[PDB]
Every structure is written in C-alpha cells, then in structure tokens.
Design a protein around this motif. Sequence first.
Motif, PDB file in Angstrom:
ATOM      1  N   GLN A 209       0.847  -1.211   0.000  1.00  0.00           N
ATOM      2  CA  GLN A 209       0.000   0.000   0.000  1.00  0.00           C
ATOM      3  C   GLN A 209       0.871   1.245   0.000  1.00  0.00           C
ATOM      4  OE1 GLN A 209      -3.295  -2.706   0.111  1.00  0.00           O
ATOM      5  NE2 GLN A 209      -2.914  -0.621  -0.687  1.00  0.00           N
ATOM      6  N   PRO A 210       0.732   2.117  -0.953  1.00  0.00           N
ATOM      7  CA  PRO A 210       1.528   3.321  -0.938  1.00  0.00           C
ATOM      8  C   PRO A 210       0.964   4.411  -0.025  1.00  0.00           C
ATOM      9  CG  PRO A 210       0.167   3.367  -2.801  1.00  0.00           C
ATOM     10  CD  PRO A 210      -0.211   2.138  -2.057  1.00  0.00           C
ATOM     11  N   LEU A 211       1.571   5.569  -0.067  1.00  0.00           N
ATOM     12  CA  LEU A 211       1.216   6.677   0.783  1.00  0.00           C
ATOM     13  C   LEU A 211       1.448   7.991   0.059  1.00  0.00           C
ATOM     14  CD1 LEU A 211       2.990   6.378   4.196  1.00  0.00           C
ATOM     15  CD2 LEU A 211       0.628   7.021   3.880  1.00  0.00           C
ATOM     16  N   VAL A 212       0.658   8.994   0.345  1.00  0.00           N
ATOM     17  CA  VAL A 212       0.887  10.345  -0.173  1.00  0.00           C
ATOM     18  C   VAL A 212       1.015  11.281   1.016  1.00  0.00           C
ATOM     19  CG1 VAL A 212       0.146  12.198  -1.716  1.00  0.00           C
ATOM     20  CG2 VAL A 212      -0.469   9.807  -2.257  1.00  0.00           C
ATOM     21  N   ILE A 213       2.126  12.015   1.080  1.00  0.00           N
ATOM     22  CA  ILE A 213       2.377  12.933   2.176  1.00  0.00           C
ATOM     23  C   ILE A 213       2.404  14.380   1.643  1.00  0.00           C
ATOM     24  CG2 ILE A 213       3.930  13.542   4.126  1.00  0.00           C
ATOM     25  CD1 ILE A 213       4.800  10.606   4.092  1.00  0.00           C
ATOM     26  N   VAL A 214       1.506  15.214   2.148  1.00  0.00           N
ATOM     27  CA  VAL A 214       1.387  16.618   1.748  1.00  0.00           C
ATOM     28  C   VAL A 214       2.016  17.473   2.837  1.00  0.00           C
ATOM     29  CG1 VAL A 214      -0.167  18.423   1.000  1.00  0.00           C
ATOM     30  CG2 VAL A 214      -0.775  16.052   0.528  1.00  0.00           C
ATOM     31  N   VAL A 215       2.957  18.366   2.465  1.00  0.00           N
ATOM     32  CA  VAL A 215       3.714  19.080   3.500  1.00  0.00           C
ATOM     33  C   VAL A 215       3.890  20.539   3.129  1.00  0.00           C
ATOM     34  CG1 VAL A 215       5.757  19.010   4.996  1.00  0.00           C
ATOM     35  CG2 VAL A 215       5.016  16.936   3.698  1.00  0.00           C
ATOM     36  N   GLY A 216       3.642  21.430   4.090  1.00  0.00           N
ATOM     37  CA  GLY A 216       4.075  22.835   3.978  1.00  0.00           C
ATOM     38  C   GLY A 216       3.396  23.575   2.846  1.00  0.00           C
ATOM     39  N   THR A 217       2.086  23.357   2.656  1.00  0.00           N
ATOM     40  CA  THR A 217       1.340  24.095   1.638  1.00  0.00           C
ATOM     41  C   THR A 217      -0.053  24.430   2.145  1.00  0.00           C
ATOM     42  OG1 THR A 217       0.472  24.034  -0.635  1.00  0.00           O
ATOM     43  CG2 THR A 217       0.780  21.918   0.488  1.00  0.00           C
ATOM     44  N   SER A 218      -0.545  25.593   1.752  1.00  0.00           N
ATOM     45  CA  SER A 218      -1.883  25.952   2.176  1.00  0.00           C
ATOM     46  C   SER A 218      -2.945  25.455   1.195  1.00  0.00           C
ATOM     47  CB  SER A 218      -2.021  27.487   2.362  1.00  0.00           C
ATOM     48  OG  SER A 218      -1.783  28.164   1.126  1.00  0.00           O
ATOM     49  N   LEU A 219      -2.538  24.813   0.086  1.00  0.00           N
ATOM     50  CA  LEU A 219      -3.489  24.195  -0.840  1.00  0.00           C
ATOM     51  C   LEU A 219      -4.566  25.198  -1.258  1.00  0.00           C
ATOM     52  CD1 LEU A 219      -3.864  20.556   0.689  1.00  0.00           C
ATOM     53  CD2 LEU A 219      -2.336  21.415  -1.144  1.00  0.00           C
ATOM     54  N   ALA A 220      -4.132  26.420  -1.525  1.00  0.00           N
ATOM     55  CA  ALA A 220      -5.023  27.491  -1.938  1.00  0.00           C
ATOM     56  C   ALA A 220      -4.812  27.901  -3.388  1.00  0.00           C
ATOM     57  CB  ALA A 220      -4.816  28.704  -1.016  1.00  0.00           C
ATOM     58  N   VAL A 221      -3.750  27.441  -4.043  1.00  0.00           N
ATOM     59  CA  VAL A 221      -3.410  27.897  -5.392  1.00  0.00           C
ATOM     60  C   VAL A 221      -3.640  26.766  -6.369  1.00  0.00           C
ATOM     61  CG1 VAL A 221      -1.601  28.738  -6.973  1.00  0.00           C
ATOM     62  CG2 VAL A 221      -1.866  29.744  -4.693  1.00  0.00           C
ATOM     63  N   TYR A 222      -4.456  27.039  -7.355  1.00  0.00           N
ATOM     64  CA  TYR A 222      -4.770  26.062  -8.386  1.00  0.00           C
ATOM     65  C   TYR A 222      -3.918  26.274  -9.627  1.00  0.00           C
ATOM     66  CZ  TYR A 222      -8.648  24.698  -5.483  1.00  0.00           C
ATOM     67  OH  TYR A 222      -9.364  24.259  -4.434  1.00  0.00           O
ATOM     68  N   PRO A 223      -3.722  25.222 -10.454  1.00  0.00           N
ATOM     69  CA  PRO A 223      -4.234  23.840 -10.355  1.00  0.00           C
ATOM     70  C   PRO A 223      -3.589  22.903  -9.318  1.00  0.00           C
ATOM     71  CG  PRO A 223      -2.874  24.079 -12.339  1.00  0.00           C
ATOM     72  CD  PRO A 223      -2.948  25.457 -11.693  1.00  0.00           C
ATOM     73  N   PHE A 224      -2.440  23.248  -8.736  1.00  0.00           N
ATOM     74  CA  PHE A 224      -1.796  22.290  -7.833  1.00  0.00           C
ATOM     75  C   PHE A 224      -2.734  21.846  -6.716  1.00  0.00           C
ATOM     76  CE2 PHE A 224       2.112  20.210  -6.543  1.00  0.00           C
ATOM     77  CZ  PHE A 224       1.907  19.941  -5.197  1.00  0.00           C
ATOM     78  N   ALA A 225      -3.583  22.764  -6.235  1.00  0.00           N
ATOM     79  CA  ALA A 225      -4.424  22.449  -5.095  1.00  0.00           C
ATOM     80  C   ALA A 225      -5.468  21.403  -5.444  1.00  0.00           C
ATOM     81  CB  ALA A 225      -5.097  23.712  -4.546  1.00  0.00           C
ATOM     82  N   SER A 226      -5.632  21.068  -6.737  1.00  0.00           N
ATOM     83  CA  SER A 226      -6.544  19.982  -7.137  1.00  0.00           C
ATOM     84  C   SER A 226      -5.961  18.586  -6.884  1.00  0.00           C
ATOM     85  CB  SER A 226      -6.878  20.073  -8.630  1.00  0.00           C
ATOM     86  OG  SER A 226      -7.457  21.297  -8.997  1.00  0.00           O
ATOM     87  N   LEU A 227      -4.638  18.462  -6.711  1.00  0.00           N
ATOM     88  CA  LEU A 227      -4.053  17.117  -6.625  1.00  0.00           C
ATOM     89  C   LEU A 227      -4.510  16.338  -5.401  1.00  0.00           C
ATOM     90  CD1 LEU A 227      -0.315  17.350  -7.844  1.00  0.00           C
ATOM     91  CD2 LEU A 227      -2.425  17.664  -9.215  1.00  0.00           C
ATOM     92  N   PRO A 228      -4.517  16.897  -4.170  1.00  0.00           N
ATOM     93  CA  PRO A 228      -4.851  16.040  -3.025  1.00  0.00           C
ATOM     94  C   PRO A 228      -6.196  15.361  -3.147  1.00  0.00           C
ATOM     95  CG  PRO A 228      -3.751  17.988  -2.235  1.00  0.00           C
ATOM     96  CD  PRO A 228      -4.050  18.229  -3.700  1.00  0.00           C
ATOM     97  N   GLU A 229      -7.230  16.029  -3.679  1.00  0.00           N
ATOM     98  CA  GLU A 229      -8.511  15.329  -3.796  1.00  0.00           C
ATOM     99  C   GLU A 229      -8.473  14.306  -4.921  1.00  0.00           C
ATOM    100  OE1 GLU A 229     -10.240  19.262  -4.344  1.00  0.00           O
ATOM    101  OE2 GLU A 229     -10.855  18.646  -6.382  1.00  0.00           O
ATOM    102  N   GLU A 230      -7.461  14.355  -5.789  1.00  0.00           N
ATOM    103  CA  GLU A 230      -7.320  13.360  -6.850  1.00  0.00           C
ATOM    104  C   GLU A 230      -6.578  12.119  -6.381  1.00  0.00           C
ATOM    105  OE1 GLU A 230      -5.609  15.483 -10.106  1.00  0.00           O
ATOM    106  OE2 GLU A 230      -7.562  16.394 -10.564  1.00  0.00           O
ATOM    107  N   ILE A 231      -6.026  12.145  -5.182  1.00  0.00           N
ATOM    108  CA  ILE A 231      -5.494  10.889  -4.625  1.00  0.00           C
ATOM    109  C   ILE A 231      -6.642   9.918  -4.422  1.00  0.00           C
ATOM    110  CG2 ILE A 231      -4.304   9.863  -2.657  1.00  0.00           C
ATOM    111  CD1 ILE A 231      -3.202  12.933  -2.282  1.00  0.00           C
ATOM    112  N   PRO A 232      -6.529   8.655  -4.875  1.00  0.00           N
ATOM    113  CA  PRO A 232      -7.613   7.690  -4.651  1.00  0.00           C
ATOM    114  C   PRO A 232      -7.976   7.595  -3.181  1.00  0.00           C
ATOM    115  CG  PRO A 232      -5.990   6.781  -6.162  1.00  0.00           C
ATOM    116  CD  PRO A 232      -5.420   8.087  -5.651  1.00  0.00           C
ATOM    117  N   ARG A 233      -9.275   7.485  -2.918  1.00  0.00           N
ATOM    118  CA  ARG A 233      -9.731   7.367  -1.541  1.00  0.00           C
ATOM    119  C   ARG A 233      -9.107   6.160  -0.862  1.00  0.00           C
ATOM    120  NH1 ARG A 233     -13.947   9.765   0.638  1.00  0.00           N
ATOM    121  NH2 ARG A 233     -14.861   8.886   2.550  1.00  0.00           N
TER     122      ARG A 233
END
Length: 287
Positions: A209-233
């Motif tokens: 099972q892999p893992l995705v670690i998000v660090v040091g971002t406010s996830l407010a700037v798009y398109p990058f901020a779209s990636l975390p919700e694109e991680i498979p549930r």
Amino acid sequence: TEMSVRKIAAHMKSNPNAKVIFMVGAGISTSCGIPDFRSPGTGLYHNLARLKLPYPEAVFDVDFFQSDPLPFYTLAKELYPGNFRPSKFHYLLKLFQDKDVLKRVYTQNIDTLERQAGVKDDLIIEAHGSFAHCHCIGCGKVYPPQVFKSKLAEHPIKDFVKCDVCGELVKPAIVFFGEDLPDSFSETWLNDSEWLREKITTSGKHPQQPLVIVVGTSLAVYPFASLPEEIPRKVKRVLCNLETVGDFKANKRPTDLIVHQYSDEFAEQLVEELGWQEDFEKILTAQ
Ligand SMILES: Nc1ncnc2c1ncn2[C@@H]1O[C@H](COP(=O)(O)OP(=O)(O)OC[C@H]2O[C@@H](O)[C@H](OC(=O)c3ccccc3)[C@@H]2O)[C@@H](O)[C@H]1O
Ligand SMILES: [Zn+2]
C-alpha cells in the motif's frame, strides 16, 4: 503527533516495497531563510515590489515581465540557488530516495532545494518550473544559467539578457503566469495516479500500500491544489502542515492523518521511528 508519526512508520514497515509520493510547498523551505516574495523587506526588491507591481504575483506574470523585467531580476537575485542550504526535510526526501521508497516529489517551490539536496531529476516534478535552466521566452533556445546569473551581479542591473537567435528576453525556466505548464507535469501525475491504483504484490499475500504525504502548503493555489482530492480514496493521505487546509479541511477522509508539525521536526521524528537515524545523519553532515 508522535502517535501519528508512529502510524506513518508502521505503515511503511508493513509495506516495505511500497513507495511514497510527497506534495510540498513553501513551508518546507521557510527554515532555510528563503524570503517570501510577498513579504516586506528593505532591499531594492521590496521597493520595486511596492512601487511597480500591481499585485504581488505579477513578479511572475510573463506579460508584466516583458514590459518590465527589473522586479523579477531583483527577486531572482534574492532567491539565487546556491545561497541557501536545503532543510532537514529536503534531505529526508534524499534519504527516502536512497531507501528506494521515493516515488515522486511534486513541488510548488522554485528554489531548486530538492535537487540540491540530491533528489534525482526524474523524481522531481515542478508545478512552477524552477531556476534549473534558462530559456528564451520567444523561441525557446536553451541558455546556460550562467549568462542570467552574470547580470544579477551588476550594479545596477540593466541590459537584461536577450536571445542571440531572436532577440526576445531570456529568463530562468520558471513557468510564469501566461505560460503553459509543460506536458510532463500532467502526464507524470496521470502515470503516478495510475500507479496509486495499482495492485503491487511482493512479500506474502497482500498488496504493497503506498502513501501520499502533503507538506508545507496551504493548498489554496490552483491547479496544484486539485491534486490532493485526486489521490484515490483507497490510498492513505498524510498532511504535515501548521494548519489543516484544502481537501483535508472540507472532505477529510476516514484514513487521513493530520499532523500539525514543522516539516523539519516531522522529518527528525519520522526518521526516529523508522530507525534510519544513522543513514540520515550521514546525509546531513555530507551536505
Ligand atoms: N515549517 C513548516 N512546516 C510545516 N508547515 C509549514 C511550515 N511553515 C509554514 N508552513 C505551512 O506552509 C503553508 C505555506 O502556504 P503558502 O500558501 O505560503 O505556500 P504554497 O506553496 O501553498 O503556495 C502555492 C503558490 O502560492 C504562490 O504564492 C506561490 O507561487 C509561486 O511561488 C510561483 C513562482 C513562480 C511562478 C508562479 C508561481 C506558491 O508556489 C502554510 O499553510 C503554513 O501553515
Ligand atoms: Zn529566442
């Protein structure tokens, strides 16, 4: 905090052939002393930012830059790669690479600190490009970074670098607003998303099972901020950030691990729990 970091380590030990994707932001470089292009200061740059920019981000706007390269030049001088030492967290990425558990680092930073800490070029994906190379904005001819860096040393800076083939402005290969993001960004995320859904089996009768670690971002700037919700549930997400942000705030998932911790101390504690202190310590002293 230490329980959450424990779980990350335990997951990695239970899935020793699985790799980790990181998604990172400006927060992982704050401890390095890199100024924030939005923050005040005393330099020529802050004078120019206040007097000449209609809004802070125009320093990265390609139409503004063509009309007036000076603000961007004076900012590049203060962000000059080589000034700053990569952080412990940057070296954690190199350590994961040495341990064969780094799938990719998606970075919103232009500071090139991942590469400078020893992360391989093919493992780094830059959401805004970087200072690694220079190009003509008109035709694309590659220039040696040195020519641009030579101008940054002049007192004052004038006669901005121009293409010898077509005469347009030469600049570091930072993706300015008004410029297209390279195809490699979106195609790499397509491939890595597909890998996040893959069944990979090695030891025993269970997937890795892999893992995705998000660090040091406010996830407010798009398109990058779209990636975390694109991680498979079905893939576990970690957020290491001083505040809960982005998709972790709205549509938090049952398996989400949220760690309100500084990125450098997260790296020390994670290495702690993984039992990689000896390898980590060698990397920090060598660099
Ligand atoms: N030590 C620490 N450990 C853990 N977390 C820490 C921490 N210190 C702070 N924090 C948390 O770190 C988050 C920082 O959030 P912030 O919005 O500042 O950065 P970002 O990367 O998300 O920004 C995305 C984009 O926004 C744009 O301005 C900028 O564009 C450009 O540079 C750019 C450049 C060239 C061309 C085009 C664009 C940027 O690339 C906050 O949540 C803090 O709580
Ligand atoms: Zn050209």
